């Protein structure tokens, strides 16, 4: 059987545009989001820690960089992870997506990943899961705990959702990350891993 | 070897490519691609992008205009047959750049020659590749279009509108808009000096 039901779900809850702009560019750099639980969403380290942008938009709503924001970087072994979860003030509440996300077993090599993202519209990517790796080190520095998958990708497209199978279950383990040469890596996300940043940052439902 | 000079690539990123974002009920921040200031109030824009009907804003030069702005275009056709190129002139505002004299090319690119993209569809950026030839039209599943040349270059989907700066004869200028790509291989829409000059003196540009 072929069922896109998990898919939908994720374009219809969990990914979402956000936007930032930088002096000089009003009309800013869109990418995807994905929102986990009342007021806090995931998004790349890279594009959070810029020190460019002045503010950005999330669900039609404008942020200023002196809000004050609640974090939590995701590092493994210290190293840093290219994943952040934030908590804006209060506000309409976000979906509880929080069983969306986490895998107890490993996709197979070879198993299909789908990307689920905002960033152009709302669309899909889609190919071969080829595995973990440790780390990934590039001109700019070292991300940990990623897994790449065979597919082109445009870095405009950072913040989607990828979508794995392991163990007949299907649930969002990652956030893209970047790509080259037609082989995107994505940052792994682990359920244990959002409930501690979701305590740490003071949200109920976990 | 020859020299290399980057000098007429970075005028046209400096005059005459800039972003212009199409916002639809789905996307209040908009979908950003590239368009080409030509002179006075005018600029080019691919016609797919021009006649969806979708869009009930865009925002250019930091200005806002709706759908309901009584805009005067010119479509470019080619025989007849719609090419994906269109010049939209602004009500009165702030002028353009007279970026007139970077446009056209008396003689074919040879094959093989350098193809420079110029875009501002993600910040500013260059994309480049071989020349790969013209093309009477592309047919896809929406139809056809005429008179475009192709480029061995990966290209995304809001990289529409980037000028394409090519060689002849010794001489350089822009005589594209980006217009789509697939499997590698970019394709853009043939801008004629002349062309330029009719569409001008249709819109009322001294």
Request: with cysteine; glycine share 12%.
């Amino acid at each position: 059987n072929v069922d896109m039901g998990f898919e939908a779900a994720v374009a219809k809850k969990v990914v979402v545009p956000i936007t930032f702009m930088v002096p000089n560019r009003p009309s800013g750099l869109t990418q995807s989001a994905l929102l986990v639980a009342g007021r806090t969403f995931l998004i790349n380290e890279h594009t959070w820690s810029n020190p460019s942008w002045t503010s950005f938009t999330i669900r039609g709503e404008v942020h200023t960089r002196d809000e004050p924001f609640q974090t939590v970087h995701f590092t493994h072994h210290g190293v840093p992870t290219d994943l952040m979860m934030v908590r804006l003030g209060p506000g309409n509440s976000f979906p509880n997506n929080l069983d969306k996300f986490g895998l107890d077993q490993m996709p197979a090599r070879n198993s299909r990943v789908v990307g689920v993202s905002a960033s152009y519209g709302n669309f899909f990517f889609s190919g071969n899961f080829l595995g973990f790796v440790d780390s990934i080190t590039s001109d700019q520095g070292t991300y940990a705990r990623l897994f790449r998958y065979r597919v082109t990708t445009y870095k405009g497209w950072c913040g989607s959702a990828l979508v794995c199978e392991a163990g007949g279950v299907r649930r969002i383990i990652g956030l893209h990350s970047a790509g080259a040469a037609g082989i995107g890596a994505g940052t792994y996300i682990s359920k244990l891993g959002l409930i501690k940043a979701l305590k740490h940052l003071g949200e109920p439902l976990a």
